[PDB]
Subunit: 537 residues, 3 copies
């Protein structure tokens, strides 16, 4: 592999190279104790760590994982937690202990969990009260799974008490001398067909890339950033963790147990958050609140990712707050790929210019660069030199990795147009992936869930336009002859509840259309593009 070769130091570790620099600055008296992590639950509990405390407590976390739990360098650890401090501590702990962290959403059902534990052959899971039961439904079928660590006020037979072990642990752990290319994280990522793939990131593709992008958000050393994210998304590691800590800035975490926009607004108004990051829906939701009542003159930087930002949202936000929203763009495999930086003119409807050292282009069917103003596929040049930030590949599936390289370019799977200044406009997914709010949904995940129901003999799942949410999961369902006599509204509701019971509810089909047939290729494949084309005007 020319792919494995990069322009990187032999060794890199975000914890020892970045976080412990700040800890050492404090200890040496060269910087005052500076807030690193500020967590609130919105019910009167708050916690704050400075960089020395964060380093000490994450060293304890690494001692729990490597010492009490006996996990060894290279072991894979599923992490499925709400927005609690232990998420940040445990990730840092894995980084310190040379363990591969694998974040997932607390929305996951038992089948989602079993798929991931079996595929990854995880040695450990760190979970909270939200998924303990779902984990225990399937853990017996996971022969590799040896450690269950629970983050909770409760104890549970079979699970180790993370919070108790952390307090018992030493605040000294010797950071593993991890290699730049060594596996650090696995993120499961949905595909255009089939079930989620394991996208492997290295110590450098996450942490060195973040160190190089540090400040892209407008954030500075003495500021506070609030990234609003599910802890399972790669957004959480890149923006909630690595962006602020590369700068020695504070990251702000609200438990946000119900995603309540009035709570978000009161939080912005009551805490001195200078920068925020959330998906476009966050800003859309906030705009439906009374912004006149909860001012936030301390807020300066508003960034977004995950779905295209409507010029209308941008307009309304500027009108109600006086602030810009600066769009960014990326995927799990590539991290931050394009963005509008704090010094760039904003062009409504465009998501900015190439990030970092990426050579991002619009390319043709042959993999050749197209001129400005021509629609094609968005790619990043990865040959002959793979830039810092691109993932290591799909785990156990180098053919899938190679499949997505066209000529010298990694394909994002998005259509786009580049203007005369190099700014990109998103022109839609080039494949069958569905983007519902932040979430990336593979149609086979949803089709499979539906097919389990006895009513469904065939189904195609596509994206569908929505006025409030933008894009939703829609299912075309062919019924067993027996269910033709059933009330469609009743059966739709039943099918939706079924999908929500069996897989993470964010994937459920908000729209179901019953049909007698679905269009087929001569190989018998459903023509989703054809259905999507009709569906979107």
């Amino acid at each position: 592999l020319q792919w494995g070769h990069q322009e990187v130091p032999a060794k890199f570790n975000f914890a020892s190279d970045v976080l412990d620099h700040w800890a050492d600055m404090e200890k040496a008296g060269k910087r005052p104790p500076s807030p690193a992590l500020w967590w609130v639950n919105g019910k009167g509990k708050e916690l704050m760590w400075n960089f020395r405390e964060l380093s000490e407590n994450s060293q304890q976390a690494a001692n729990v994982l490597s010492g009490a739990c006996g996990l060894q360098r290279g072991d894979r650890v599923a992490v499925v937690l709400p927005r609690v401090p232990e998420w940040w501590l445990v990730i840092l702990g894995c980084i310190r202990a040379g363990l591969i962290f694998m974040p997932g959403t607390i929305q996951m059902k038992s089948t989602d969990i079993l798929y991931r534990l079996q595929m990854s052959k995880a040695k450990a899971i760190v979970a909270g009260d939200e998924v303990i039961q779902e984990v225990d439904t399937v853990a017996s079928e996971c022969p590799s799974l040896r450690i269950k660590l629970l983050v909770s006020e409760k104890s549970c037979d079979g699970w180790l008490n993370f919070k108790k072990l952390l307090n018992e642990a030493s605040t000294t752990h010797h950071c593993v001398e991890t290699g730049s290319q060594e596996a650090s994280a696995i993120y499961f990522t949905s595909g255009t067909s089939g079930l989620p793939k394991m996208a492997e990131h290295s110590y450098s593709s996450l942490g060195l890339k973040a160190k190089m992008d540090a400040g892209w958000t407008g954030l500075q050393a003495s500021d506070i950033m609030w990234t609003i994210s599910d802890t399972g998304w790669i957004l959480n590691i890149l923006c909630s963790l690595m962006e602020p800590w590369a700068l020695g800035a504070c990251t702000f975490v609200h438990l946000l147990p119900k995603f309540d926009p009035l709570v978000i607004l009161k939080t912005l108004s009551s805490y001195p958050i200078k920068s925020m990051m959330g998906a476009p829906i966050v800003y859309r939701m906030l705009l439906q609140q009374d912004l006149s009542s909860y001012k936030f003159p301390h807020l300066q930087n508003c960034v977004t990712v995950g779905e295209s930002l409507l010029p209308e949202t941008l307009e309304n936000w500027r009108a109600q707050t006086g602030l810009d929203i600066r769009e960014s763009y990326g995927q799990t495999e590539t991290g931050l790929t394009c963005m509008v930086s704090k010094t760039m003119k904003i062009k409504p409807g465009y998501m900015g210019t190439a990030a970092s050292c990426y050579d991002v282009q619009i390319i043709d069917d042959k993999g050749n660069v197209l001129p400005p103003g021509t629609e094609g596929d968005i790619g990043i040049r990865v040959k002959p030199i793979r830039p810092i930030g691109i993932f290591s590949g799909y785990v156990d599936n180098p053919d899938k990795t190679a499949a997505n390289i066209r000529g010298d370019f990694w394909l994002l799977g998005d259509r786009g147009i580049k203007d005369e200044d190099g700014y990109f406009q998103f022109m839609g997914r080039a494949d069958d992936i569905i983007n519902s709010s932040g979430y990336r949904i593979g149609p086979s995940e949803v089709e499979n869930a539906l097919m389990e129901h006895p009513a469904v003999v065939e189904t195609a799942v596509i994206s569908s336009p929505d006025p409030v949410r933008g894009e939703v999961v829609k299912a075309f369902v062919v019924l067993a002859s027996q269910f033709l006599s059933h009330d469609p509204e009743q059966l739709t509701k039943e099918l939706q509840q079924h999908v929500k019971s069996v897989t993470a509810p964010y994937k459920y089909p908000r729209k179901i259309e019953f049909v007698l047939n679905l269009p087929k290729t001569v190989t018998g494949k459903i023509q989703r593009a054809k259905l999507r084309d009709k569906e979107w005007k």
Copy 2:
């Protein structure tokens, strides 16, 4: 004149006959919007026109020239611009408006400009920031000069703002019904003695000739060609403009502000350029770069003109890239005269066979055809029928035109040998013209510059062999007795700087030899041939 008579239609215009065919194909839906002009500055700005846009924008250009500027059919327009899109637009505009365009290099000094404006009696000049000051030094002495159009981000008192007028102009202009033999361009061309002559080309000698040669380069309709040229050279009109547009292909333009070979290499590697054209120096420079690092597997056709291609350059290029270089040959008066086409065997050291409908021969002192393997003068048969592509003659100087006809043959002024297959080998200039890289230098231009200095009482300028550049300008200088005590290296440097200050720097004498005398004919002419003979071994 039997000379004026040709086998041509009564009317021809490249813009209406060729360019607007492609524009109309797009508009009619018979061809998809196809790239015509793709310009980059190498700092992140790119612009592309399709054939409809190119036609619209050049119609605007013609409206600026004929409408806002009041220029009338037959008016002569000096064009002195860098490699910016407005060069292509303005030339097309002149073609549309039946205006005689007269390109020159941005390397020109005020004296060069005044000579050309006064000789031509130009009504207009189109210039950029590179020469505005030089133009303004002398414009008051040019009574015919009425319009100064500046292509710039700046405005300047006395100059019309081309870019602003173009945007204000209509995209509809009715193309002048120009005659086949009507003057379209004047190119100033250096002579063996004296100062540059005005070589007049017609609508047909440029555009119909190009239409007939279309594809000689190997270029096809859906390809991109990069011709690397000074915009003042006739090479730019024939290969950067007319060759690709006769085919409906895209022409690629890089500003290339510094002629940086690493920039050329990165450009070849990063853009899907299928054909390239440059003088041999371009390929020589590229060969000194790391071609292993910047591959260009999309490149298929490499053509050259302007200086003889060393078999060594040909060899090295094939070794490092796997590609041939196909040589071509021509002069300002004749356009493309010989070449190696894409289907011809390459014979190293030969420049191919007669182009187009040219009867190219080696001829004797009487104007008779010589057998293969005999050195003589290269000529094109122009009587009794002057072939399409030969210029109309030297403006105001029909005696100079006639002087260069020997029997039935136009003399190229080069020596050559023709082989058994009709392939020509260049055997050197037959006169005192100096060829330094692409540039054709008349010795009187350089001698005159030198004589202006008080040290120089006599001088002869000849070509001299050079290992790196091939051929250079050398001056023999007889000193005023007063300067005999001066340090020669100091005075050489001073004389070189003087020549560079007074005339386009490409002509400067890279070598100066101080001598006490120069050999004279009985008419008192310096014997340059004698000096050149000694100089070249």
Copy 3:
């Protein structure tokens, strides 16, 4: 793996980094054309390459391999050639083309070859007339084997003509940008039990290690070295190739078709060889010749490896020639491990001090360092940092690699004592490996060969002391009851011929003892140590 981590540049390639430096020095005029390879056949043919010619001709070799043969980066190439220039060219060619070369001896029989081709899944073999027939006996059973390249004056159906393709090939090849840790060579190496393992070396463990040791032999830039070696031994790559070429010195190769000591002596006397390297047997053989008749006052450096140098050989050599022999020590996995350098006092019976950056120690059963004067196992410290020069591991067998690490130390498998100055004395093999002259013999290889014969129902192969050769292969053979009536001298001769017919003849048992039984552990293993102990007094 902390093992994979090293203090090395990301990229290394001996050909581009070392050899092409010397080639470029010549081309740039900064060094005169300097001999690189001087080959003689001892019948009046000689050939010499300078560094430019060596680079050109090896670039041709790389073009044969990658171009004509279509071999791709990472493909494995068996090389089985006599001492001809094409060995050096082909190895360099593989290095340039990022191909894994796998040298073996021309003494190999068809079964030896099939084992290696099947184990390695080689895509190609480069062979000469010595093994073509043996290769063709088994090549059909090697589904991965696609290319057979023959180095010969003859052509053979099925084999490509290497010498013809090389001459047809371009002298320009763009060196692959190989990684420091990327596989460069596989050497098959015998084990204490079972059949030979694949020892993988990297671009850096061979070439960067050699660059760092360059000159250990006493060799300088303007000298000639003669390494006397089978081309299959790692000695050939480290000392015949990399040591002289790291220095810009000449390597001298004599075909030496019969290993004739009078030929070696006449060669030393007739050519200005300043340094020589051979196994102790070379010097022993030379000492039986008339050194008074063939003086070599130009010879300055005599080095040895492969078997312990008797103080008697050292003494006799000094007495007859006035020269020292400087001992070195290493194995396939470790390269040059200890040696007596040109500035070190020679202590008869000791093999010098740790090479390069190796921390070489005598260690106990726990892996702890022992004091001077205590016998233990020779080890190299490989944790936490594996030094440059240690191989990458056994291919497909990381458990075998790990098996030989005791604590933080790679085990050489030799016993030794270290003196107060750090000099090591060899105290014998710690396992069942047999060292006969240069050759390392695994007993299972020989036992297996013998067991194929119907007379042999059981056998143990051990080392045995020999006055002339030092150590020989001895077989204990238990006979089938049917062969008890056979003449032992006849049957011994027959068994020896059998072993020589089926496997490389260097392994054959020079001594056979017929016995009625062999001592067994409670697991039923033959106690070879017990037999060897009795055998050696």
